Design a protein around this ligand. Structure first.
Ligand SMILES: Cc1cc2nc3c(=O)[nH]c(=O)nc-3n(C[C@H](O)[C@H](O)[C@H](O)COP(=O)(O)O)c2cc1C
Ligand SMILES: Cc1cc2nc3c(=O)[nH]c(=O)nc-3n(C[C@H](O)[C@H](O)[C@H](O)COP(=O)(O)O)c2cc1C
Lengths: 130, 130
């Protein structure tokens, strides 16, 4: 009873297209797939904010994610700068995760931001959701 | 007493320009800087292979780096796919690290690959070096 171990440190990557509108996800590693429960077909082409919604079925972002941080992310993207912050997020199966997220934008060959990398650190949280 | 901790999990990664010749480094995160000993300005614009020479002065790759694995890396970068292996690397203070390495190419708005994401997982190793 000691198996199916990971061979590398679990790091969670997601990359988006900064040219096409609204930063669609173009890649996710299988650690994101493993922690959030979302396989990659489900999320490819969508925008990450679906993580702020509790469950695949939830229509609206959950009350409890700090709308002030969500706005910092927005501000940071629109200025093409790094973002660093913590916010609530939800697995497919509803579980809550505090996500320490870092967003670094990547430049293309014309002094323009063509992609954005997001590194997720998903911490378990005992938050009460009601 | 305990402090100076880091707030996220230590994930090491770099991004290279896949358009410009020979995959120059355009981004390193600070985990890379902190595990390898090389600072961002020392490595920006250079190719990652300096990690296979032992130290910042050696200009030739170290004998015990597996020439076969380096070759497979070359094949995958060329074939436009993902590499996934383990490869002897060296900190700038000379110490050996088994670098469990993953290369993941990223397509631009185009059908061409414009960037590669490299995720290092450095491991301590008592490999005898002479
Ligand atoms: C590369 C990248 C990764 C992101 N990852 C997450 C994430 O993991 N969790 C999250 O809640 N938001 C993430 N976001 C941000 C959301 O898309 C965010 O809500 C949006 O960028 C700004 O807020 P808005 O939808 O209200 O405009 C990410 C953004 C980018 C560009
Ligand atoms: C994005 C990226 C990251 C890389 N990171 C490393 C690394 O950490 N250690 C290493 O030995 N090689 C790394 N490499 C491999 C070298 O840069 C190079 O592609 C490889 O050594 C094969 O080419 P060469 O035989 O011309 O040296 C990386 C390559 C890329 C594209």
């Amino acid at each position: 009873p000691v198996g199916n171990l990971l061979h590398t440190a679990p790091c969670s990557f997601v990359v988006t297209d900064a040219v096409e509108p609204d930063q669609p996800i173009i890649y996710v590693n299988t650690v994101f797939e493993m922690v959030t429960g979302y396989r990659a077909e489900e999320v490819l082409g969508r925008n990450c904010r679906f993580l702020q919604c509790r469950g695949p079925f939830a229509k609206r972002r959950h009350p409890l994610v700090d709308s002030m941080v969500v706005s910092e992310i927005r501000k940071c993207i629109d200025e093409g700068i790094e973002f660093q912050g913590e916010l609530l997020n939800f697995r497919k199966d509803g579980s809550p995760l505090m996500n320490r997220l870092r967003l670094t934008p990547i430049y293309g060959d014309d002094d323009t931001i063509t992609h954005i990398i997001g590194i997720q650190f998903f911490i378990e949280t005992d938050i009460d959701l009601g």
